[PDB]
Design a protein around this motif. Structure first.
Motif, mmCIF file in Angstrom:
data_model
loop_
_atom_site.group_PDB
_atom_site.id
_atom_site.type_symbol
_atom_site.label_atom_id
_atom_site.label_comp_id
_atom_site.label_asym_id
_atom_site.label_seq_id
_atom_site.Cartn_x
_atom_site.Cartn_y
_atom_site.Cartn_z
ATOM 1 N N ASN A 15 0.811 -1.222 0.000
ATOM 2 C CA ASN A 15 0.000 0.000 0.000
ATOM 3 C C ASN A 15 0.838 1.263 0.000
ATOM 4 O O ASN A 15 0.447 2.233 -0.629
ATOM 5 C CB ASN A 15 -1.019 -0.010 1.128
ATOM 6 N N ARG A 18 1.859 1.726 -3.539
ATOM 7 C CA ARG A 18 0.714 2.235 -4.305
ATOM 8 C C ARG A 18 0.591 3.744 -4.088
ATOM 9 O O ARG A 18 0.314 4.463 -5.039
ATOM 10 C CB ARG A 18 -0.598 1.527 -3.894
ATOM 11 N N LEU A 19 0.809 4.226 -2.841
ATOM 12 C CA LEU A 19 0.782 5.669 -2.548
ATOM 13 C C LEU A 19 1.918 6.371 -3.308
ATOM 14 O O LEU A 19 1.699 7.438 -3.895
ATOM 15 C CB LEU A 19 0.898 5.942 -1.037
ATOM 16 N N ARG A 22 1.175 6.746 -7.084
ATOM 17 C CA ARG A 22 0.136 7.767 -7.306
ATOM 18 C C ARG A 22 0.531 9.143 -6.757
ATOM 19 O O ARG A 22 -0.271 10.082 -6.801
ATOM 20 C CB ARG A 22 -1.195 7.294 -6.713
ATOM 21 N N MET C 45 -3.078 5.078 6.582
ATOM 22 C CA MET C 45 -3.724 4.845 5.273
ATOM 23 C C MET C 45 -3.484 3.433 4.766
ATOM 24 O O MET C 45 -4.392 2.818 4.201
ATOM 25 C CB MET C 45 -3.206 5.830 4.214
ATOM 26 N N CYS C 47 -3.115 0.765 6.413
ATOM 27 C CA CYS C 47 -3.772 -0.221 7.285
ATOM 28 C C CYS C 47 -5.256 -0.115 7.369
ATOM 29 O O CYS C 47 -5.896 -1.066 7.829
ATOM 30 C CB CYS C 47 -3.184 -0.131 8.690
ATOM 31 N N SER C 48 -5.807 1.070 7.066
ATOM 32 C CA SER C 48 -7.214 1.360 7.325
ATOM 33 C C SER C 48 -7.931 2.007 6.155
ATOM 34 O O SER C 48 -7.471 3.027 5.635
ATOM 35 C CB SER C 48 -7.285 2.271 8.557
ATOM 36 N N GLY C 49 -9.071 1.436 5.783
ATOM 37 C CA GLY C 49 -9.912 1.988 4.725
ATOM 38 C C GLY C 49 -10.433 3.364 5.086
ATOM 39 O O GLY C 49 -10.539 4.232 4.216
ATOM 40 N N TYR C 52 -7.454 5.825 4.835
ATOM 41 C CA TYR C 52 -7.169 5.939 3.403
ATOM 42 C C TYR C 52 -8.104 6.992 2.760
ATOM 43 O O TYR C 52 -7.636 7.854 1.996
ATOM 44 C CB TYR C 52 -7.325 4.577 2.706
ATOM 45 N N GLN C 107 -12.359 0.175 9.165
ATOM 46 C CA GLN C 107 -12.337 -0.614 7.920
ATOM 47 C C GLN C 107 -11.020 -1.398 7.807
ATOM 48 O O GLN C 107 -10.221 -1.163 6.909
ATOM 49 C CB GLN C 107 -12.606 0.258 6.677
ATOM 50 N N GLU C 109 -10.454 -4.994 7.532
ATOM 51 C CA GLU C 109 -11.185 -6.226 7.223
ATOM 52 C C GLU C 109 -10.591 -7.503 7.805
ATOM 53 O O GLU C 109 -11.366 -8.325 8.283
ATOM 54 C CB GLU C 109 -11.423 -6.386 5.713
#
Ligand SMILES: O=C1Cc2cc(Nc3cc(Cl)ncc3Cl)ccc2N1
Ligand SMILES: O=C1Cc2cc(Nc3cc(Cl)ncc3Cl)ccc2N1
Ligand SMILES: [Cl-]
Ligand SMILES: [Cl-]
Lengths: 122, 4, 122, 4
Positions: A15, A18-19, A22, C45, C47-49, C52, C107, C109
């Motif tokens: 992740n 990915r950051l 972008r 971000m 780790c968490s929706g 993010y 979030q 999961e």
């Protein structure tokens, strides 16, 4: 008495990469000759003894631009920046010398170790 | 999940 | 044709947790009732929706303070923040309900999934 | 180091 999620660290790094792709929350530009590389200071510090020293310095911690030594090859840096964010090292016959020299400068001991092993084998 |  | 360093992601996460414990490069305070938690936006971000969504928002990305919903329990948050930086979840009979509710709100999961499994077993 |  904690439980552990095996894939958590890898998923966190994926992740963060990915950051990076972008350009989200990147807070520094690393200048290598003419080339510019955007990154997250925390990731650079977590991977490199050199960036750890730079960003814990009370004055340098606040810089948005860091210029590397002119001897540093942009391709060697790019390969190492990719490794920082993925755990994957694109080590090839044509780049191994530039990768080892850049890893020694950046103080990335495990990369230096595998480069020395691969050079010794050939 | 595992017991570390 | 890359090679891979197995322990790289875990070592990166360990160093990010060391930066958190020493309050280095932390760029946000998460307020949960009276309690305050310092962290790195990028790690939250990754780790968490919920984080993010917050930090990709053009206005919220620039906030240094984030206040969570008053129903969120500070201990549940603390356990989850520790998991984000270590992959280790301190799940106990006395905290499982607060941990699951906080993970649903944040979030996260995989944490929600293990809480549902552990509740079902009892 | 491994072959991924
Ligand atoms: O080969 C290497 C990789 C590396 C990483 C870091 N970064 C940290 C180290 C500690 Cl103890 N806490 C926090 C951080 Cl971010 C320092 C030196 C080196 N050398
Ligand atoms: O359970 C979860 C954990 C999680 C993490 C993130 N964070 C990202 C996702 C992507 Cl695709 N790119 C970058 C980031 Cl930082 C989003 C949703 C969720 N849900
Ligand atoms: Cl390394
Ligand atoms: Cl999760």
């Amino acid at each position: 008495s904690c439980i552990q999620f095996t894939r958590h660290a890898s998923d966190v790094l994926l992740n963060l990469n990915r950051l990076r792709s972008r350009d989200i929350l990147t807070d520094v530009v690393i200048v290598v000759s003419r080339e510019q590389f955007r990154a997250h200071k925390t990731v650079l510090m977590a991977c490199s003894g050199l960036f750890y020293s730079i960003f814990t310095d009370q004055l340098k911690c606040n810089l948005s631009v860091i210029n590397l030594d002119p001897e540093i090859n942009p391709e060697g840096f790019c390969i190492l920046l990719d490794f920082m964010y993925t755990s994957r090292l694109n080590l090839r016959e044509g780049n191994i010398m530039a990768v080892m020299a850049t890893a020694m400068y950046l103080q990335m001991e495990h990369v230096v170790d595998t480069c020395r092993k691969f050079i010794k084998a050939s | 999940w595992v017991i570390p």
